[PDB]
């Protein structure tokens, strides 16, 4: 990164830890939270990586960096899958028509079960890929599947744990 600022390791540790908890504590389910904050996270994350570069082997800063990077990886992955689910739900809503009356109802999704099969497969991949972020995955993608399950009857492993 192009910068002339200098930070001590104590300052670098504080910045990295603050960003790590800011991302993990944020509610990823609300789309607007990621839209508004991600631009701020990226700017900070660029600074944190630059100042923490000499401490990637440090016994304290090192683990924080690995968790921070892993959390950002999971945030983008969960957002992408849940973003697709939102599109499917929005398509279903518009197919209802005006006032849910069908007055100007649009064309329905003809391959809804296929989409449900595709989304659930992606959901399983997240769980295997990010074993330490299940609470966040269930918050965004797991809850999204439950909403879809109301529209269409499909089977996924955790369906019974969502009262289905």
């Amino acid at each position: 990164m192009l910068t002339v600022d200098k930070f001590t390791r104590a300052e670098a540790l504080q910045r990295a830890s603050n960003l790590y908890y800011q991302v993990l504590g944020t509610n990823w389910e609300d789309g607007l939270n990621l839209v508004l904050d991600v631009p701020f996270w990226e700017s900070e994350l660029e600074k944190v990586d630059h100042m923490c570069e000499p401490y990637l082997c440090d016994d304290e800063i090192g683990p924080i960096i690995r968790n921070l990077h892993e959390t950002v990886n999971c945030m983008y992955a969960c957002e992408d899958v849940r973003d697709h689910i939102n599109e499917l739900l929005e398509l279903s809503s518009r197919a209802e028509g005006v006032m849910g009356s069908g007055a100007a109802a649009s064309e329905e999704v003809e391959n809804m079960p296929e989409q449900c099969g595709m989304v659930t497969k992606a959901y399983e991949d997240l769980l295997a890929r990010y074993p330490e972020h299940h609470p966040k995955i269930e918050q965004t993608v797991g809850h999204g599947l439950a909403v879809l399950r109301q529209l269409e009857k499909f089977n996924f492993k955790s369906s019974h744990r969502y009262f289905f």
């Binding site: 994350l45 660029e46 990586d49 990637l56 960096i65 690995r66 990077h69």
Partner: protein
């Protein structure tokens, strides 16, 4: 096996006529110009190296390497081994070294090396060397006493290009007058390189003295005086027509698929005629012994070598004499070797540990097709020369008997050296090419290990006795003002 050549069976590769359009599809893809491009940010710019980034790697396919032998219809033999490494080592060996020169042809073998990778029928000098450079390949040519080698080291995906460039040196080189005249510079550089390596320079003095003015005594390097008269494209072409032929050439490839290597080599000779094979005068070396005292005013140290003739690589004494070299071993003060690095060889125990004035003592052993040299090389300060020779002579008189422990240690160290030297690919390439040129056969490292285990003390005594009956060759280099005379050495060894 479809053809047996000089004791080895090869698979015959048939020439095939292929349209140039079809082959062009198979040439490796590369560019010299990058006129524009599609911009793409480094996706791993924020990923530390400790985090793996590659996923879904195909499972590896491991095969035990095996040496395979093939031959073209023009008579060029192809030997390759695929160790599944990522860098190839292509080598072209031609049975035309300095030993085949007549006195009027002095230095022509070295001249051929100097004009290597110059203009060919289908490529310019500049285009050849820029292609080698852009593709990240290294290599060169080296002319020896019995063979001349062209070698390239490259990423294996570019093998089709490299094989073509090497072959062009012997298929259709344009020995243009002005290009050849630009190679006169290399003669002075070659002398400087040789004289810098004191061990090699003394080795050349040995061979010139050991074989007086005949095959193995011909100077390796051309002189820069009267030899330049025939340093001409026409003279070089006449020399190549005498000796360079597909029947005397072997192509060696390490870490290359054999079928691909054979296919591309076949396509290179498909529509062209190689130099025809003609009989040549092949005379056995004449060993005379003798001595030479070469002063080097700058050096204060004295390098002494005493050598004896050996029957050579094709004899049954190859392994016993090699075991004798490891038993005596040697070493030097310069280095401080740890365990297993010759600290208990006979020369190290009997010379270096007991004579603080000895700077270094070693046993050398050069092997060629039908002759070789074995002896001791000892160095020290100039004024010490009379004592250095006495030490060397005393060791030569102790080769009458060997203890069982020494024989076993020598055999085990030799086997370790064989296996450890083999794992180097450039070494394996040069070993295979030299063996086929010398003998027409390849003895694998494991087969040499079996021979080493069969060497007994009786064999060592017999081989040593034969060596000591030859007229010694006595070379002194550096500060020679105190060395003993040749007759002193001969009388000392006359008793044996």
């Amino acid at each position: 096996g479809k053809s047996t050549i000089q004791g080895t069976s090869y698979n015959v590769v048939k020439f095939q006529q292929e349209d140039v359009s079809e082959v062009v599809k198979e040439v490796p893809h590369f560019q010299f110009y990058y006129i524009g491009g599609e911009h793409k940010d480094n996706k791993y710019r924020d990923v530390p190296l400790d985090i793996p980034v590659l996923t879904e790697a195909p499972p590896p396919q491991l095969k035990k390497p095996e040496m395979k032998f093939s031959v073209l219809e023009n008579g060029m033999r192809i030997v390759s081994v695929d160790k599944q490494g990522l860098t190839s080592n292509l080598g072209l060996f031609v049975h035309a070294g300095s030993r085949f020169e007549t006195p009027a042809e002095e230095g022509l073998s070295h001249m051929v090396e100097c004009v290597a990778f110059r203009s060919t029928a289908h490529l310019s000098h500049l285009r050849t060397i820029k292609t080698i450079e852009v593709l990240g390949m290294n290599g060169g040519c080296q002319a020896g006493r019995e063979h001349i080698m062209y070698n390239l080291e490259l990423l294996r995906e570019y093998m089709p290009v490299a094989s073509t460039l090497v072959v062009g040196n012997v298929l259709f080189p344009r020995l243009l007058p002005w290009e050849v005249n630009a190679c006169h510079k290399e003669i002075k550089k070659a002398h400087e390189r040789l004289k810098a390596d004191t061990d090699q320079y003394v080795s050349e003095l040995l061979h010139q003295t050991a074989y007086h003015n005949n095959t193995l005594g011909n100077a390796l390097l051309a002189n820069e005086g009267r030899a330049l008269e025939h340093f001409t494209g026409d003279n070089i072409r006449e020399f190549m027509m005498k000796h360079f032929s597909a029947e005397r050439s072997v192509f060696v490839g390490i870490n290359v698929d054999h079928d691909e290597l054979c296919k591309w080599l076949m396509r290179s000779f498909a529509e062209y005629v190689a130099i025809p094979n003609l009989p040549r005068d092949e005379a056995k070396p004449v060993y005379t012994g003798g001595y030479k005292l070469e002063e080097n005013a700058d050096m204060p140290v004295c390098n002494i070598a005493i050598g004896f003739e050996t029957e050579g690589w094709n004899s049954a004494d190859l392994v016993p004499v090699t075991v004798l070299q490891t038993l005596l071993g040697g070493g030097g003060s310069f280095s401080t070797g740890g365990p297993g690095k010759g600290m208990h060889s006979r020369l190290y125990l009997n010379v270096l540990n007991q004579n603080p004035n000895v700077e270094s003592c070693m046993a050398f052993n050069t092997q060629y097709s039908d002759s070789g040299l074995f002896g001791m090389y000892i160095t020290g300060f100039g004024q010490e020369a009379p004592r250095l020779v006495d030490i060397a002579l005393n060791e030569l008189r102790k080769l009458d008997s060997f203890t069982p422990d020494e024989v076993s240690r020598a055999k085990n160290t030799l086997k370790g050296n064989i296996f450890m030297n083999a794992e180097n690919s450039k070494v394996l390439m040069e070993d295979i090419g030299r063996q086929i040129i010398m003998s027409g056969k390849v003895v694998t490292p494991e087969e040499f290990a079996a021979r080493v285990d069969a060497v007994t003390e009786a064999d060592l005594k017999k081989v040593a006795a034969k060596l000591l009956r030859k007229n010694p060759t006595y070379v002194v280099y550096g500060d020679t003002k105190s060395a003993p005379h040749y007759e002193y050495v001969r009388t000392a060894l006359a008793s044996l």
